[PDB]
Design an enzyme around this catalytic site. Structure first.
Site, PDB file in Angstrom:
ATOM      1  CB  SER A 162      -0.961  -0.163   1.214  1.00  0.00           C
ATOM      2  OG  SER A 162      -1.594   1.023   1.677  1.00  0.00           O
TER       3      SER A 162
ATOM      4  CG  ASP B  36      -5.997  -4.357  -4.322  1.00  0.00           C
ATOM      5  OD1 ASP B  36      -6.618  -3.373  -3.888  1.00  0.00           O
ATOM      6  OD2 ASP B  36      -4.843  -4.654  -3.949  1.00  0.00           O
TER       7      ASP B  36
ATOM      8  CG  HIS C 158      -5.698  -3.290  -0.576  1.00  0.00           C
ATOM      9  ND1 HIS C 158      -4.892  -3.041  -1.664  1.00  0.00           N
ATOM     10  CD2 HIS C 158      -5.445  -2.301   0.315  1.00  0.00           C
ATOM     11  CE1 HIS C 158      -4.160  -1.964  -1.433  1.00  0.00           C
ATOM     12  NE2 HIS C 158      -4.482  -1.492  -0.242  1.00  0.00           N
TER      13      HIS C 158
END
Ligand SMILES: CC(C)C[C@@H]1NC(=O)[C@@H]2CCCN2C1=O
Length: 269
Positions: free
Chosen positions: A98, A219, A248
């Site tokens: 991320s 995702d 995710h």
């Protein structure tokens, strides 16, 4: 501005495992380093693993958060490099989820000799759509996220956590929700604004390190074509590893599957 030395304590740095190969694990939005707990034992028999908390994690004293400094990802890069320099680590592999995938890209440009390999999970160089660029979000969509986060953080987090996890894995939803709720709501909103406004497309070619991009089958913040975009534009040799799972947060929801990919990526570098 705390030195790398003081950051070792402020950001809860841990070093575990054994061996010559150093791997840094850098968590994503809404978590802390405990997000790596389920995959960590798949690495520590034969890697030396460095873990730390981003300054925005709920497990970091919120009095350390600087709303000026950290409105750009370059300040998070500064913290990472200061930790590695304090630990006297001259070469490592870096695994980022991320926002930490973005931090790792920038760190590898800042200090190319320090990063032997990058592993990027749940990674995007730009979330906002642009001409012939599908990032997944329009401006009015991200503004609504900010409005929801500010109006009712608890309700927003309760709705977001299952979407981020994606798959039907209730313990992953509970674990992600716990660290989301542990963040102070104004810091969480600030980091979200900082991430959603970042555009790394113009510097991807300056990355020299080989890269593995880990992409799940669905995702919510990263379209599959964004993984292809990273492969197309990163400056080092890049492989996209497609994980046969949804979500995710595969380190929370599918750690054994993610671990097989990580061990292959970290076997030699
Ligand atoms: C709309 C949904 C599919 C996307 C999701 N929503 C959100 O609010 C969070 C904010 C941070 C990243 N997020 C996301 O990707």
């Amino acid at each position: 501005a705390p030195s790398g030395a003081k950051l070792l304590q402020i950001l809860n740095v841990r070093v575990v495992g054994s061996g010559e190969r150093v791997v840094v694990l850098s968590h994503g939005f809404g978590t802390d380093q405990s997000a790596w707990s389920r995959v960590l034992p798949y690495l520590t028999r034969d890697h030396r693993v460095v873990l730390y908390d981003l300054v925005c994690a709920g497990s970091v004293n919120p009095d350390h958060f600087d709303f000026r400094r950290y409105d750009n990802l370059d300040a998070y890069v500064d913290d990472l490099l200061a930790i590695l320099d304090a630990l006297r680590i001259p070469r490592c592999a870096f695994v980022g989820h991320s926002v930490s995938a973005m931090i790792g890209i920038l760190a590898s440009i800042r200090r190319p000799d320090l990063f032997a390999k990058l592993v990027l999970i749940g990674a995007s160089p730009r979330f906002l759509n642009d001409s012939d660029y599908h990032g997944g979000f329009e401006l009015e969509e991200i503004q609504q996220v900010f409005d929801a986060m500010g109006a009712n953080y608890s309700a927003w987090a309760t709705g977001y956590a299952p979407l981020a996890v994606g798959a039907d894995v209730p313990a992953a939803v509970q674990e992600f929700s716990r660290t989301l709720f542990n963040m102070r709501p104004d810091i969480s909103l600030h980091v979200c604004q900082t991430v959603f406004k970042t555009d790394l497309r113009g510097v991807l070619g300056m990355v020299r390190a080989p890269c593995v991009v880990v992409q799940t089958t669905r995702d919510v913040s990263v379209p599959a074509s964004v993984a292809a975009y990273l492969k197309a534009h990163l400056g080092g040799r890049t492989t996209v590893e497609f994980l046969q799972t949804e979500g995710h947060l595969p380190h929370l929801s599918a750690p054994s599957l993610l671990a097989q990919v990580l061990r292959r990526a970290l076997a030699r570098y």
